Design a binder for this molecule. Structure first.
Ligand code: IX6
Length: 561
């Protein structure tokens, strides 16, 4: 079966799409080489369509079936509930795509009668029709990157059903996709961990091995590798739970009418083609991808003869750490792993490489690195190449965007050199300049949208990373070099310039008192030689962070609050 078939109609925009980073004084103060920063647009959709379109050959075997049985057995212990229309409405993001039926996200969030009447009709139709494919829209994502001269990445494609259907997905499946993944994959389910917990997991997994070896496995176009049988298997797993009778009907209908495939319509209403793989923009994308990746990977580890594996799975992202059998044996085992994954429909982009140092493994864009606290104690933390974060931060300074990656990056990468010295300094300075310090902003954590107050960053950071996040120094030479080269590449001022700026920002924050002063004291202690004593933040204990690290929701149109 082909992942997609196409009619020749274009993937079309629904508004003008700005291509190049605009010139703005505040954005330019972060990053000057604006010609190297671009947004993907519908203009490159054809290139992406070509890449994501291929035939899937899938052959399953006894290891695969053995793992599937384990998963179904674990699922049978789960109880999940329906959400009410009101509950589902409250999970809809404020800038969720408008319905084609005359209402938008705001109407959903305020339980407007036109929205609710339509939602109720969609629900009824799910209960009454289990077969007619549901329409989806195909759009080109507008995402910002820095050039790497094949130059520019083509746009990723998002495929999503109508707003009314999305609310019904929440009613049928929000509780399932929030509970089931952790229950059936246990410690391997990556989205249950804060950043601090994720680094603890990876480090302990590595340390526990006599002679560790690890790798990341990069499936080429994972969504396109997911077969109709994969998606029906997911449905069978969902049905192992104790569910409400109406949920069972809706879940089957959603599977058969939406998740397994369906027609692709552009923003002009034209038929673009037909999908027989994973939809990138449905509630079950993260759960389904994670389950499918886990099942295939766990089976493939057995096929590969890998010894004492520890896996960490987040959607299509897979890390395995295991006991080395020797260099040639390990290399052969990774070839066998790849052959198994390939048989299961998931061949690699880049072939996996065995790594014998933890820092060399990249997972969810990130690698483990080490710094030191004030007493010379090694502290592990997750970092990443800052290029994309910085490029997006510059864009988000020049233009108002619905969701701010910069805030998510500060939250998730708070212990890093670059988040601390550059992102914190820049954004506190911009927020002060624009008189926006007190304003909550939308960002994403594991794909769910949150409204977060920047003045709450210090206790958030303490909870996610530990108090040491405000005291790290003596970073690794390789990390320092990577950041430095990024700054030269992008025309970002050097770190010592940011330090000078941070001293001013800090004094301004301290002068304001309250939460602002806590931001000055804790976030910018690094910028002064005469340091303040950083004691545990009282507010940290009081923060309700329930649901932050429960499940992944990228593509699933979820808002938490
Ligand atoms: C704890 C760590 C420090 C390391 O582990 C992480 C770190 C971050 C995420 C979140 C996020 C990001 C950007 C952020 C921070 C700005 C927001 S985020 O937390 O949602 N990036 C990434 C990646 O760069 C790579 C993979 C997945 C995601 N993420 C997704 O959820 C996601 N899934 C899809 C299909 O696409 C995306 C963007 C994650 F899941 C795991």
């Amino acid at each position: 079966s082909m992942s997609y078939s196409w009619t020749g109609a274009l993937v079309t925009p629904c508004a003008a799409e700005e291509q190049k980073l605009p010139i703005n004084a505040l954005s330019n103060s972060l990053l000057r080489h604006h010609n190297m920063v671009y947004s993907t647009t519908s203009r490159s959709a054809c290139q992406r369509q070509k890449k994501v379109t291929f035939d899937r050959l899938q052959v399953l075997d006894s290891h695969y079936q053995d793992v599937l049985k384990e998963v179904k057995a674990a699922a049978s212990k789960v109880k999940a509930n329906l959400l009410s229309v009101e509950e589902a409405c409250s999970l809809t993001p404020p800038h969720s795509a408008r319905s084609k039926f005359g209402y938008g996200a705001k109407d959903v969030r305020c339980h407007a009668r036109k929205a609710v009447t339509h939602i109720n009709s969609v629900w009824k139709d799910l209960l009454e029709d289990s077969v007619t494919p549901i329409d989806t829209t195909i759009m080109a994502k507008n995402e910002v990157f820095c050039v790497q001269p094949g130059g520019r990445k083509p746009a990723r494609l998002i495929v999503f059903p109508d707003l009314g259907v999305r609310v019904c997905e929440k009613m049928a499946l929000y509780d399932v996709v929030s509970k089931l993944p952790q229950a059936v994959m246990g410690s391997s389910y990556g989205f249950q961990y804060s950043p601090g917990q994720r680094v603890e997991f990876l480090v302990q997994a590595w340390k526990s091995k006599k002679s560790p070896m690890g790798f990341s496995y990069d499936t080429r176009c994972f969504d396109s590798t997911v077969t109709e049988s994969d998606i029906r298997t997911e449905e069978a797993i969902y049905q192992c739970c104790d569910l409400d009778p109406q949920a069972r009907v809706a879940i089957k209908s959603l599977t058969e009418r939406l998740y397994v495939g369906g027609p692709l319509t552009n923003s002009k209403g034209e038929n673009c083609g037909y999908r027989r793989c994973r939809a990138s923009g449905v509630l079950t994308t993260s759960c389904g991808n994670t389950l499918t990746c886990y099942i295939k990977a766990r089976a493939a580890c057995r096929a590969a003869g890998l010894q004492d594996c520890t896996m960490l799975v987040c959607g299509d992202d897979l890390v395995v750490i295991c006991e080395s059998a020797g260099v040639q044996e390990d290399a052969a085992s990774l070839r066998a792993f790849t052959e198994a994954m390939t048989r299961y429909s998931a061949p690699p982009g880049d072939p996996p490489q065995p790594e014998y140092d933890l820092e060399l493994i990249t997972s969810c864009s990130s690698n483990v690195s080490v710094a030191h606290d004030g007493a010379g104690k090694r502290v592990y933390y997750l970092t990443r190449d800052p290029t994309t974060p910085l490029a997006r931060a510059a864009w988000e300074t020049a233009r108002h965007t619905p969701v701010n990656s910069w805030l998510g990056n500060i939250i998730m990468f708070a212990p890093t050199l670059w988040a601390r010295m550059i992102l914190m300094t820049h954004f506190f300075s911009v927020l002060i300049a624009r008189d926006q310090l007190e304003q909550a902003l939308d960002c994403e954590i594991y794909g769910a949208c949150y409204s977060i107050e920047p003045l709450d960053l210090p206790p958030i950071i303490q909870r996610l990373h530990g108090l040491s996040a405000f005291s790290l120094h003596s970073y690794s030479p390789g990390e320092i070099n990577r950041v430095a080269a990024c700054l030269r590449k992008l025309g970002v001022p050097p770190l010592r310039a940011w330090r000078h700026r941070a001293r001013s920002v800090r004094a301004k924050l301290l002068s304001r008192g309250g939460r602002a002063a806590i931001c000055g004291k804790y976030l910018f202690n690094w910028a002064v030689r005469t340091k303040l004593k950083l004691t545990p933040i009282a507010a940290a204990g009081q923060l309700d962070l329930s649901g932050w690290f429960t499940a992944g929701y990228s593509g699933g149109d979820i808002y938490h609050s």
